[PDB]
Amino acid sequence: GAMDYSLVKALQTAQQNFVISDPSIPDNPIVYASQGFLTLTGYALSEVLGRNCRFLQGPETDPKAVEKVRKGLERGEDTTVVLLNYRKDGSTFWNQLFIAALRDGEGNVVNYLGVQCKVSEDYAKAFLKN
Ligand SMILES: Cc1cc2cc3c(=O)[nH]c(=O)nc-3n(C[C@H](O)[C@H](O)[C@H](O)COP(=O)(O)O)c2cc1C
Numbered sequence: 001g002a003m004d005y006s007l008v009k010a011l012q013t014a015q016q017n018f019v020i021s022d023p024s025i026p027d028n029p030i031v032y033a034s035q036g037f038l039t040l041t042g043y044a045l046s047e048v049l050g051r052n053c054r055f056l057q058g059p060e061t062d063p064k065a066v067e068k069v070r071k072g073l074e075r076g077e078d079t080t081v082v083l084l085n086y087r088k089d090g091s092t093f094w095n096q097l098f099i100a101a102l103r104d105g106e107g108n109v110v111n112y113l114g115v116q117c118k119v120s121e122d123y124a125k126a127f128l129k130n
């Protein structure tokens with residue numbers, strides 16, 4: 001169960017920004033966060049473990065983008081969205097966010113994986129147009 005996912009280890013090797021959540025815990029909080037994610041967001045590891053990643057959202061984040069993540073999770077569909085996120089210091093960035101369920105043999109979702117890619121403002125407008 002623990003980081004023995006090939007794909008998690010692949011992601012660390014590529015120095016990606018990601019978190020793992022555990023939905024058997026109430027509110028599906030973060031139980032792993034990569035150094036990339038911490039550097040991107042300005043948070044320390046002990047500021048994110050045990051928190052739902054919605055803390056990155058703020059008043060100018062689009063509730064429809066968030067709604068699309070929520071429904072993806074409910075319907076067990078992989079999702080990709082571009083949404084505005086906030087770092088610890090309150091500065092904002094556009095996050096191309098990729099979320100997938102990690103399932104066992106029986107089809108049970110044992111974790112979720114989220115990978116963040118920081119994108120430019122121009123990238124985000126173009127994306128959100130289509
Ligand atoms: C593994 C995982 C990673 C992320 C990473 C991010 C992120 O880098 N920025 C962000 O802005 N929201 C995220 N989310 C969404 C958030 O944790 C909530 O799932 C949504 O806000 C919808 O739920 P509700 O707020 O409606 O309850 C995630 C959800 C999961 C499961």
Ligand SMILES: [Cl-]
Pocket residue numbers: 027028052073
């Ligand atoms: Cl969630």
